Design an enzyme around this catalytic site. Structure first.
Site, PDB file in Angstrom:
ATOM      1  CD  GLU C  13      -3.251   0.662   2.012  1.00  0.00           C
ATOM      2  OE1 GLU C  13      -2.997   0.830   3.223  1.00  0.00           O
ATOM      3  OE2 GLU C  13      -4.376   0.289   1.592  1.00  0.00           O
ATOM      4  CE1 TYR C  16      -0.721  12.103  -1.164  1.00  0.00           C
ATOM      5  CE2 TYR C  16      -2.833  12.465  -2.255  1.00  0.00           C
ATOM      6  CZ  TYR C  16      -1.790  12.929  -1.473  1.00  0.00           C
ATOM      7  OH  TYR C  16      -1.814  14.221  -0.993  1.00  0.00           O
ATOM      8  CD  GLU C  82      12.804  -2.841 -12.202  1.00  0.00           C
ATOM      9  OE1 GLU C  82      13.504  -3.862 -12.391  1.00  0.00           O
ATOM     10  OE2 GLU C  82      13.275  -1.684 -12.246  1.00  0.00           O
ATOM     11  CG  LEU C  84      12.452  -5.542  -8.061  1.00  0.00           C
ATOM     12  CD1 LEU C  84      12.062  -4.174  -8.619  1.00  0.00           C
ATOM     13  CD2 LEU C  84      13.858  -5.498  -7.517  1.00  0.00           C
ATOM     14  CG  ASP C  87      10.633  -4.923   1.868  1.00  0.00           C
ATOM     15  OD1 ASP C  87      11.538  -5.166   2.682  1.00  0.00           O
ATOM     16  OD2 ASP C  87       9.452  -4.882   2.259  1.00  0.00           O
ATOM     17  CG  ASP C 128      11.051   7.949   3.108  1.00  0.00           C
ATOM     18  OD1 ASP C 128      11.446   7.901   4.287  1.00  0.00           O
ATOM     19  OD2 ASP C 128       9.858   7.641   2.883  1.00  0.00           O
ATOM     20  CE  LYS C 130      10.170   3.871   5.186  1.00  0.00           C
ATOM     21  NZ  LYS C 130       9.238   4.833   5.955  1.00  0.00           N
ATOM     22  CD  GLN C 132      11.082  -0.113   6.320  1.00  0.00           C
ATOM     23  OE1 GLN C 132      11.428   1.034   6.561  1.00  0.00           O
ATOM     24  NE2 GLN C 132      11.760  -1.160   6.758  1.00  0.00           N
ATOM     25  CG  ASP C 146       8.239   4.590  -1.460  1.00  0.00           C
ATOM     26  OD1 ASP C 146       7.977   5.791  -1.223  1.00  0.00           O
ATOM     27  OD2 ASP C 146       7.435   3.674  -1.113  1.00  0.00           O
TER      28      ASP C 146
END
Lengths: 10, 258, 294
Positions: C13, C16, C82, C84, C87, C128, C130, C132, C146
Site C-alpha cells: 500500500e 495515496y 517493474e 520486485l 524488500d 526516504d 530505509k 522498506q 519509492d
C-alpha cells in the site's frame, strides 16, 4: 490585490 | 558539493536541449501573440509575488507554457487558463507549501472554475508527458554564482533580474538556451555592478566566452536599457524591493565594450 | 492500458494508493501497478505524484526501480513499475537466525551506492531511504524505490521541506534544524542501513526528534565545533545537550572488519560537507572483493 484579475486580450 | 556540481551541470546541459520549446510557435498560433504571452508572463510574476513563490517556480511555469503552446493552439480566452495550470504545476513541483487550487482560481477573478483548472492541469501533464524537471535560467545562475570573488549580492539579484526579464519576450529570448541567457545575464550584472567580466573559470566550466555570448548579450543589453519603458512592469516593481537589494533601481551601462 | 494487465494479488500500500502485482497478458511481463485515485474538485494530481513521475522518468539505472508506464484516466492515474518480489526489510526478518552473509551485504550496499550516486549525479534527493524502500529481486539485484518524498535540488541548494526522512534514518543536520541540507542526508540513511544489514537491528531507533539526537550522540559523540564547525550555532542545537564521549567505533558494529568500519565511519560523519559521498564510497576497499550473490 493587483495580482487577481481576469486577463483581457481582445 | 563539487562532488556532483560538474556531473549535474553536464546533465542540465544535456537536458536543456531536450526540454527546449520550438522557436517559431507563435507564428502558428492563430489567436495569440507575443504581447499576450508577455502579458501572461507579466501576470504570473505578480501571482508569484502575491503568493510569495520562488523565482524558480516562476521559470518552470513559463517553460511549461512555451512547451505547451509549442504543440497546442489556444484561444486567447484560454491563455490565462493554460498559464494558471502551469503555475500550479510548477508550484506543486518546486514549492514547500504550494498554494491550493482554490487560490489559483481565486486570483483569476473567478474567470475559470476549479474543475477547469484541474482539467487543464491534466491536459498540460499529458502534453508534457510528465516531463517537469526542466533546467531554467535560474538553475544556471545559481551555479555561475559560485564563481564570484568575492560573492556580491547586488550582482546576484541583478542577474536574477535580467534573467527574469527575459521570460517576458518570446522574441527573441526563445531562441537562446537557458544556460546562455544565464551567461549573458551574469556577465551583464557583474559588469554593471563592479565592472568585472565573464570569469575564465566559467569559461573552463561551461565553454562559453563573451564571444559566444555576444548575440544574446546584445539583445539583453537593449532589454535592460529599454526596461523602464517596457509595456510590462511587474518585474521592475518586484526588484525595487529590499529583498532583491533594490537592483531594479540601478543604472544600466551605456556600453559593454565587447 | 489496463486492457492487457491481469491483476494477481495485493502486494502493498502506498501513501495515496494501493499496489497490486499484475501481468501483461501480451508480453507476459510481471509488474507493480501503484494506483492513484483522482476525484476532481480535489487538489488534482498530488505533488508527490508529480515529482515521483517526473523524476523517476529521468533515472534509468539498474539499481533504481524502473517506471515502465503511466496510464491516464479522467479519473485514475496508474503507475506501472517493474516488479520486485521482496524488500530488504522483509528479507532481513527472513534472515533472523542465519543473519546476512557479509558478501551479500557488501553487494547490496555496493548496488545501492551505485543508485544513489546516480540520483545525486542527477540532482535528485531521495529523502526516504530505509529498508522498506529498498526492493530486491531473485537474481540478486537490490534497487532504490519509492520516490514519493523525493525532490529535484539546485546548486547550491535552497532551504527545502524540513520535515524529512523517516525518523530512524534521519540525519543530524535535519534534526538540528539547519537551513540547508543536500545529498549527504541520503548517505546517513544508507549508513544506518549498512549498520542494519549487519546486526539486523536498527542503529538509531528513536521515538522523538530529541530522542533521535541523543541516540546519535551516544554512539558517535555529542558533536562540538572541532568535530563539526557551526553546530553550536545551529537552530535546534542546545547548550544543555549532554556531552557524551564517542564510542570506539568497533563497538557500534562489532562484526565489521577494518574497512567496513572505516566506510560506515565515513558514511556516519557529522559534518555534512565531509560525509563521504556515494560516488566516492564506491572506491572504498571494503568493496575490493565485491561480488553479486543471491
Amino acid at each position: 490585490p493587483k495580482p487577481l484579475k481576469k486577463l483581457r486580450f481582445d | 558539493v563539487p562532488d556532483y556540481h560538474e556531473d549535474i551541470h553536464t546533465y542540465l546541459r544535456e537536458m536543456e536541449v531536450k526540454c527546449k520549446p520550438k522557436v517559431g510557435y507563435m507564428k502558428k498560433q492563430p489567436d495569440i501573440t507575443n504581447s499576450m504571452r508577455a502579458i501572461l508572463v507579466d501576470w504570473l510574476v505578480e501571482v508569484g509575488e502575491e503568493y510569495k513563490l520562488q523565482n524558480e517556480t516562476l521559470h518552470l511555469a513559463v517553460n511549461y507554457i512555451d512547451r505547451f503552446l509549442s504543440s497546442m493552439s489556444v484561444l486567447r480566452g484560454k491563455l490565462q487558463l493554460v498559464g494558471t495550470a502551469a503555475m500550479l504545476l510548477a508550484s506543486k513541483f518546486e514549492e514547500i507549501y504550494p498554494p491550493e487550487v482554490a487560490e489559483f482560481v481565486y486570483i483569476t477573478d473567478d474567470t475559470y472554475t476549479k474543475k477547469q483548472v484541474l482539467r487543464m492541469e491534466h491536459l498540460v501533464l499529458k502534453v508534457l508527458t510528465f516531463d517537469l524537471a526542466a533546467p531554467t535560467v535560474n538553475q544556471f545562475l545559481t551555479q555561475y554564482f559560485l564563481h564570484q570573488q568575492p560573492a556580491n549580492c547586488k550582482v546576484e539579484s541583478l542577474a536574477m533580474f535580467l534573467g527574469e526579464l527575459s521570460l517576458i519576450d518570446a522574441d527573441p529570448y526563445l531562441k537562446y538556451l537557458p544556460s546562455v541567457i544565464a551567461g549573458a545575464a551574469f556577465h551583464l550584472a557583474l559588469y554593471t555592478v563592479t565592472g568585472q567580466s565573464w570569469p575564465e573559470s566559467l569559461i573552463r566550466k561551461t565553454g562559453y566566452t563573451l564571444e559566444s555570448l555576444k548575440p544574446c548579450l546584445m539583445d539583453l543589453h537593449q532589454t535592460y536599457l529599454k526596461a523602464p519603458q517596457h509595456a510590462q512592469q511587474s518585474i521592475r516593481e518586484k526588484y525595487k524591493n529590499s529583498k532583491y537589494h533594490g537592483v531594479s533601481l540601478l543604472n544600466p551601462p551605456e556600453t559593454l565594450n565587447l | 492500458s489496463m486492457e492487457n494487465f491481469q491483476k494477481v494479488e495485493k502486494i502493498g500500500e502506498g501513501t495515496y494508493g494501493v499496489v497490486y502485482k499484475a501481468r501483461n497478458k501480451l508480453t507476459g511481463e510481471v509488474v507493480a501497478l501503484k494506483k492513484i485515485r483522482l476525484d476532481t474538485e480535489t487538489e488534482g494530481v498530488p505533488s508527490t505524484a508529480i515529482r515521483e513521475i517526473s523524476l523517476l522518468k529521468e533515472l534509468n539505472h539498474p539499481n533504481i526501480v524502473k517506471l515502465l508506464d503511466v496510464i491516464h484516466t479522467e479519473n485514475k492515474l496508474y503507475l506501472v513499475f517493474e516488479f520486485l518480489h521482496q524488500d530488504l526489510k522483509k528479507f532481513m526478518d527472513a534472515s533472523a537466525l542465519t543473519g546476512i552473509p557479509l558478501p551479500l551485504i557488501k553487494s547490496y550496499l555496493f548496488q545501492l551506492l551505485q543508485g544513489l550516486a546516480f540520483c545525486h549525479s542527477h540532482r535528485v534527493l531521495h529523502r526516504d531511504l530505509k529498508p522498506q524502500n529498498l526492493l530486491i529481486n531473485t537474481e540478486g539485484a537490490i534497487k532504490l524505490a519509492d520516490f514519493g518524498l523525493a525532490r529535484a535540488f539546485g546548486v547550491p541548494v535552497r532551504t527545502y521541506t524540513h520535515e524529512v526522512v523517516t525518523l530512524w534514518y534521519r540525519a543530524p543536520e535535519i534534526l538540528l534544524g539547519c537551513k540547508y541540507y543536500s545529498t549527504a542526508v541520503d548517505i546517513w540513511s544508507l549508513g544506518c542501513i549498512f549498520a542494519e544489514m549487519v546486526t539486523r537491528r536498527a542503529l538509531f531507533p528513536g521515538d522523538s526528534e530529541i530522542d533521535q539526537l541523543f541516540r546519535i550522540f551516544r554512539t558517535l559523540g555529542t558533536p562540538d565545533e572541532v568535530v563539526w564547525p557551526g553546530v553550536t550555532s545551529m537552530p535546534d542545537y542546545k547548550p544543555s545537550f549532554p556531552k557524551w564521549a564517542r564510542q570506539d567505533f568497533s563497538k557500534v558494529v562489532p562484526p565489521l572488519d577494518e574497512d567496513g568500519r572505516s566506510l560506515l565511519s565515513q558514511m556516519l560523519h557529522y559534518d555534512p560537507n565531509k560525509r563521504i559521498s556515494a560516488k566516492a564510497a564506491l572506491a572504498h576497499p571494503f568493496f575490493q572483493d565485491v561480488t553479486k550473490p543471491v
